[PDB]
């Protein structure tokens, strides 16, 4: 088995959503935050040739940087991980599934109620800002034929009535009305251009961010409102 910079990147992201993770034979990876809010999945170029669980995904990936690029990763005679370098060998502990949290099956997102998109640059500005202005919540909504994102600080403004940031996305040719609230703490999306799919059905609200690499599924707050 081998892991390229690209794969190592997406995994490092996944590390921030969950410290651990369970790799399963194939060219598909997925994960989900322990608090059960975020779900991440992606298709990679590298083929995973053995099933193993990592307790500390981030630390493992950092050790990879300390060895060759073609280093071979494999299951060792003792059950742990063997990273074969050129003149050396690095060993890493194989975790016991019970000591980490992971999805049993991927998430099947429903057909979106609303579809829009957000460009790499806007997404980055959104995140950068939010930390500066202490934006703990954002609300995606339709205003005058357009989709905009309004950022608030729910602690002080529980009614999401006083916006600190405001980004205009795409046109909305629909005829519904909605105010989808997402907690910024769950926005652990890696940079890139994403297709945004918001879904509403009664109390059930969830958003799906999808790029050519990764896909994230995020549960939306109860504050949300929509007439779908």
């Amino acid at each position: 088995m081998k892991l390229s910079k690209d794969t190592i990147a997406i995994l490092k992201n996944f590390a921030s959503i969950n410290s651990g993770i369970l790799l399963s034979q194939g060219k598909f990876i997925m994960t989900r935050a322990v608090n059960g809010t975020t779900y991440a999945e992606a298709n990679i170029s590298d083929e995973i040739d053995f099933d193993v669980a990592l307790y500390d995904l981030n630390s493992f990936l950092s050790i990879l940087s300390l060895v060759s690029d073609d280093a071979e990763i494999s299951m060792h005679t003792d059950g742990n991980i063997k990273i074969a370098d050129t003149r050396s060998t690095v060993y890493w502990p194989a975790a016991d599934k019970s000591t980490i949290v992971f999805p049993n099956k991927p998430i099947q997102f429903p057909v979106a109620s609303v579809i829009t998109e957000i460009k790499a640059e806007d997404l980055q500005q959104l995140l950068r800002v939010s930390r500066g202005l202490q934006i703990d919540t954002i609300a995606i909504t339709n205003k005058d034929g357009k989709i905009v994102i309004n950022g608030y600080n729910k602690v002080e403004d529980s009614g999401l009535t006083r916006p600190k940031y405001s980004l205009t996305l795409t046109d909305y040719d629909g005829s519904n009305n909605f105010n989808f609230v997402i907690n910024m703490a769950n926005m652990k999306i890696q940079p890139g251009n994403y297709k945004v799919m918001l879904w509403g059905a009664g109390d059930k609200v969830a958003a799906k961010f999808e790029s050519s690499q990764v896909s994230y599924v995020i549960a939306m707050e109860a504050d949300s409102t929509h007439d779908f």
């Binding site: 059960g36 099956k105 991927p106 099947q108 769950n186 599924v217 939306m220």
Partner: peptide, 11 residues
Amino acid sequence: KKASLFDMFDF
């Protein structure tokens, strides 16, 4: 009120 995917999905 806790936003949780387990309130909508099977995984």
